[PDB]
Amino acid sequence: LLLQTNLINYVTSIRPNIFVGRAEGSTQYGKWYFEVMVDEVVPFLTAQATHLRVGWALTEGYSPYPGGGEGWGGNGVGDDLYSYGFDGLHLWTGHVARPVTSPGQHLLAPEDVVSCCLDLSVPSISFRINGCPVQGVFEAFNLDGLFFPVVSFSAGVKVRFLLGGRHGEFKFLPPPGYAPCHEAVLPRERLRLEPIKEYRREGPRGPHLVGPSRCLSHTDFVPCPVDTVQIVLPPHLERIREKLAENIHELWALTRIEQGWTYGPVRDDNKRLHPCLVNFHSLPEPERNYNLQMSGETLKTLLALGCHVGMADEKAEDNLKKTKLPKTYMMSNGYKPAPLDLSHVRLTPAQTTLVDRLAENGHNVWARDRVAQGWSYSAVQDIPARRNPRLVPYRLLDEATKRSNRDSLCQAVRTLLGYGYNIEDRVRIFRAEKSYTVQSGRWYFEFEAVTTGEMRVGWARPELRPDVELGADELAYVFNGHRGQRWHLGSEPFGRPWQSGDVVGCMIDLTENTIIFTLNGEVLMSDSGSETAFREIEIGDGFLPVCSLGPGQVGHLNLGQDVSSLRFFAICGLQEGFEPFAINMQRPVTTWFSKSLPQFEPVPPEHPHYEVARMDGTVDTPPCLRLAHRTWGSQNSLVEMLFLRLSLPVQFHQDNRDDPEIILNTTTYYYSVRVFAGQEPSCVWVGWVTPDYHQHDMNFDLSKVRAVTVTMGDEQGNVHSSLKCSNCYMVWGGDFVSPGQQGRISHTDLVIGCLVDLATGLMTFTANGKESNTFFQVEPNTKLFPAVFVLPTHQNVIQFELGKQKNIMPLSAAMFLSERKNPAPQCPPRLEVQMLMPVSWSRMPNHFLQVETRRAGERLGWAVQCQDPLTMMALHIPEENRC
Amino acid sequence: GVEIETISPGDGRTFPKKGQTCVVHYTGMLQNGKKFDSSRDRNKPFKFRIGKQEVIKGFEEGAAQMSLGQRAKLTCTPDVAYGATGHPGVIPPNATLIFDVELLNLE
Amino acid sequence: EIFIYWSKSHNFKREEQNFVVQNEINNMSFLTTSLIVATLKKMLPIGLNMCAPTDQDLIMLAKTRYALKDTDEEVREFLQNNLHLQGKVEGSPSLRWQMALYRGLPGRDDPEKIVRRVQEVSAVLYHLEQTEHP
Numbered sequence A: 001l002l003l004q005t006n007l008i009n010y011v012t013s014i015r016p017n018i019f020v021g022r023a024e025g026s027t028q029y030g031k032w033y034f035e036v037m038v039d040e041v042v043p044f045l046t047a048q049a050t051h052l053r054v055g056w057a058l059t060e061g062y063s064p065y066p067g068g069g070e071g072w073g074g075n076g077v078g079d080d081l082y083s084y085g086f087d088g089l090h091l092w093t094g095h096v097a098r099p100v101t102s103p104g105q106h107l108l109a110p111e112d113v114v115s116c117c118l119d120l121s122v123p124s125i126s127f128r129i130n131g132c133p134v135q136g137v138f139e140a141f142n143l144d145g146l147f148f149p150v151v152s153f154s155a156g157v158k159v160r161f162l163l164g165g166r167h168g169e170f171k172f173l174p175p176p177g178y179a180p181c182h183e184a185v186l187p188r189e190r191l192r193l194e195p196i197k198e199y200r201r202e203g204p205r206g207p208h209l210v211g212p213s214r215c216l217s218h219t220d221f222v223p224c225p226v227d228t229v230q231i232v233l234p235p236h237l238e239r240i241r242e243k244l245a246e247n248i249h250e251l252w253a254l255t256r257i258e259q260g261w262t263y264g265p266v267r268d269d270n271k272r273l274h275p276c277l278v279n280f281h282s283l284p285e286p287e288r289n290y291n292l293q294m295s296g297e298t299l300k301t302l303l304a305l306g307c308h309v310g311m312a313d314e315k316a317e318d319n320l321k322k323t324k325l326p327k328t329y330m331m332s333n334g335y336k337p338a339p340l341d342l343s344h345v346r347l348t349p350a351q352t353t354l355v356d357r358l359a360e361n362g363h364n365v366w367a368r369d370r371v372a373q374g375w376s377y378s379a380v381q382d383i384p385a386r387r388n389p390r391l392v393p394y395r396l397l398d399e400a401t402k403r404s405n406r407d408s409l410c411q412a413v414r415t416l417l418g419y420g421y422n423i424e425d426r427v428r429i430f431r432a433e434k435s436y437t438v439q440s441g442r443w444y445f446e447f448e449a450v451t452t453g454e455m456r457v458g459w460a461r462p463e464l465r466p467d468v469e470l471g472a473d474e475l476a477y478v479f480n481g482h483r484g485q486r487w488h489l490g491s492e493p494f495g496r497p498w499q500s501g502d503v504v505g506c507m508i509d510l511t512e513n514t515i516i517f518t519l520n521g522e523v524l525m526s527d528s529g530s531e532t533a534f535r536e537i538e539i540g541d542g543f544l545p546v547c548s549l550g551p552g553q554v555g556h557l558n559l560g561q562d563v564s565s566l567r568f569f570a571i572c573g574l575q576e577g578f579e580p581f582a583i584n585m586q587r588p589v590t591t592w593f594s595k596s597l598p599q600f601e602p603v604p605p606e607h608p609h610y611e612v613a614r615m616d617g618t619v620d621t622p623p624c625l626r627l628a629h630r631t632w633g634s635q636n637s638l639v640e641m642l643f644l645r646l647s648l649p650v651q652f653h654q655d656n657r658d659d660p661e662i663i664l665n666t667t668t669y670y671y672s673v674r675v676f677a678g679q680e681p682s683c684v685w686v687g688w689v690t691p692d693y694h695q696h697d698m699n700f701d702l703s704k705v706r707a708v709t710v711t712m713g714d715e716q717g718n719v720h721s722s723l724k725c726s727n728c729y730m731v732w733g734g735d736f737v738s739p740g741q742q743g744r745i746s747h748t749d750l751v752i753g754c755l756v757d758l759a760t761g762l763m764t765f766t767a768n769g770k771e772s773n774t775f776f777q778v779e780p781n782t783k784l785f786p787a788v789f790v791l792p793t794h795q796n797v798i799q800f801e802l803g804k805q806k807n808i809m810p811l812s813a814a815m816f817l818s819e820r821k822n823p824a825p826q827c828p829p830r831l832e833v834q835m836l837m838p839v840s841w842s843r844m845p846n847h848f849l850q851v852e853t854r855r856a857g858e859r860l861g862w863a864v865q866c867q868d869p870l871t872m873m874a875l876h877i878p879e880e881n882r883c
Numbered sequence B: 001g002v003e004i005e006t007i008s009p010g011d012g013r014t015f016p017k018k019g020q021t022c023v024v025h026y027t028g029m030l031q032n033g034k035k036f037d038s039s040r041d042r043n044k045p046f047k048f049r050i051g052k053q054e055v056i057k058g059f060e061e062g063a064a065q066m067s068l069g070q071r072a073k074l075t076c077t078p079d080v081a082y083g084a085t086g087h088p089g090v091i092p093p094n095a096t097l098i099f100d101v102e103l104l105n106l107e
Numbered sequence C: 001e002i003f004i005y006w007s008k009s010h011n012f013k014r015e016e017q018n019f020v021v022q023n024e025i026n027n028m029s030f031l032t033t034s035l036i037v038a039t040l041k042k043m044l045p046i047g048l049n050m051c052a053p054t055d056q057d058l059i060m061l062a063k064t065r066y067a068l069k070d071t072d073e074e075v076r077e078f079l080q081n082n083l084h085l086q087g088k089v090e091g092s093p094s095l096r097w098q099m100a101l102y103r104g105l106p107g108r109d110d111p112e113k114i115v116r117r118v119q120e121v122s123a124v125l126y127h128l129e130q131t132e133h134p
């Protein structure tokens, strides 16, 4: 009923760049391993608790932000359903403690080993204590991205990763068919340990502001070639097939003999007898068909992508001859390569430009054929195991193999043209605290740029929107750096683009109402105008320092306070009348940034769209909350996400003549949602959500709803405990439509109710008095908001109805305390309507946890340590279950 | 009566026989995860006494079924507890209590 | 000394204006109005490095003395009698960091030199303010 306070520790998380997800494109083997060796942990370093866990994660929302979050403070592995973890005894996912048993029940103690296994195509995660299995598994994830094997800790921990593949092998034998976790390294990239979703790094000069990162997804390792089914290869192109195939095969043989390859029966170059030294009419058929169809598909895509070939000449092709070779090409059996001359012609630079396109297509085709055959990528080559370290489609390869493919396809194009045949997402807006605004003075701060890209530095009013682009409105005067643009309601060119490592100043004179910028060591000038680049901006209500960071970038904003360490304010600055922004400040300035966590906030009055008007009930009408679009003339339509403002806990954790004998002893509530005419019922989802819901999707449907199940079984089955969990339970309005309605615009109203049983946690739905078939079971002590998500297609969209049915209490009966026995609807002002705000402000903590990551060696694995505590005074809002 | 589930192995053959004053460190939280009492905030052990209860009897037997280094997660039912009246202003009536008792046995 | 002489003369100011238009001089490409003051505005900061921020008080009344149409000898004697009225506000936070920054220079207290630099700075600053409001 009132706000509560406590002391909570800080939590972090570290993952290796071993992204292991898969959708359909050989992105992973399917069965993967994980080893963690915990040497020592100090229980209750500070006097709250000690936190140490291992588990998996997902690159689809797992962003544990230090400080607040969900629940009472810390949010490590075991947060919202994107992550799954397992401590010594329990096993949590989605912020609920599921106790599971294991031999020698104990918390994660010093000198222990924890094993984890991930299995796909039958989604599952299996844990193992040292020498014994665990009695609990997962079965029903919603795989959409790659998985990080992560660990979480509070303070005073000593853990080592044991991914394997080196002299520091696993402490236990993996189950058969499981990868040894040393693969999936994504070549052209090393194996490092990094924190997840960082926004503040410790650089040589101190703090570095870090923008959002960029990582691949599940639909990125799939080899996607060009559509090559219907192009109709002409017989004129069919006549070259064999000659081109023979040329490329003999050049392949030349490249192989460059390593000394000879003709024999067996591979293993130590023997040096791999059979590859025959002409195109003498290879074994299994390779013959593949080689001839490889040349065929090269020509096939050549015709497909365009560049219509033409009959340049034929006498040159007829008179083209072979080339002499030295004695190093003659080999023991007697084969000699026959390289056709290639210096006779040279390709257009456009031809060289698209030389790499068909190389990309050929490598994609190779990957597609290999995955169809049944091979998967591995860091270590293993032909008998059908593993090859070259199955990344094109873009994650290494430059050596890329250049080899370019050389092969370039020589193929050389040969073809020799015979004539002429060929024709979010951003972060860092900002100083609102208490540091200054309305009159002369100040200057020095921004530093390390990586070139999209960044913006300047001044903004205190009431700055954290979602709109910086400078796109009248509340911020900012300066871009990628192209030198003044960015106050426009993109007029101003100055020159910066470089890497230089600084850019930001200088304000509110007495004369001007903002002047400066580059590295000099004051820049506009295209034609003089200095004072903003021409008498209004004072308003002061100004604040603001920095903008793009995707994959870092920054080094310097708000004074270290005038000795400033790289400038001597060449310029102090000669004029100016002072550093934080010259006299013992405490370093704390900053507020933009967080990409979609939170629920009340609808704002006078909103351009989504007008909400509360309506009082009548004798025949219950009280209603309605949503009305106010600008359906030309405005945009977006998938709104709304819920009610108050919770509804499920208790017991341990005509229409209402009869008081039963209505006073029932635990059922009915509230219904009515749709309006014109709005398509197929675009309305009505149901319930939990406080740990954060999904925000433009293509949201019932399929993409977070859902994870846990089966706390035993060795001999014992599937008694097979409960599931989710943060969104609802039904789709498209299933509540008669089969004769599709094909025309509906003109009636469909009302969908919501029936729950607080006594037993049973849920069911009804539509227009007809019982449905879907139902959900919820664990006790669960808060379930009344929620509805709709994509509007009418001026009037939805209308809440806190109605009361026969012998069923209305929502207001359990919405509050004093109305526990009142069989009448009520709509107190607290029960407002809120929508899903995409982003919201947050406070950067003054300090941060100091975690040391290093490679202990080739035997002990990778070392992660932390030896100092850190506490924060939490303020837990109780009805939202967030602090 | 009470639940004697363990969180740490500890050592076994240090049971409190009778009379001796045992030393425990307790963190007490209500249902729903809400916490009301924790001696770790004051950094002072409770210095539990046996026989002359002056405490909740459920907590008494929960601590009795413990030994050195054996952290116990007690699940005291609202029968051997503050009862149907509860502690006014702190513990609402008729609620289970969760305890995190760790015995140090400084005697 | 050239800039003040341009300001403290009538023929000097009009001759420059009559010279640019007659010869069709650009006077804008070289800057990438437009007169001698362009160089002064681009060289005042380096000449201001000897201002000795503890003498910022001195530069206040010195400009007003120049507003009295007093000669160089008059202001030199005027400042010579105010040597005791230096800054001496080291306890204030406004001059606290300025003193440290001055002491941190990589380069190098005679009263004759002190009175010479303040008067020279005042003459440039005073006439600049006279033309700062056209």
Ligand SMILES: O=C1CN(/N=C\c2ccc(-c3ccc([N+](=O)[O-])cc3)o2)C(=O)N1
Pocket: A248, A252, A287, A290, A291, A408
């Ligand atoms: O990965 C392998 C496979 N293999 N031997 C089997 C075959 C069959 C066809 C080819 C083949 C590969 C590449 C190109 N090319 O680059 O035009 C041309 C033919 O190899 C082998 O020794 N390394």
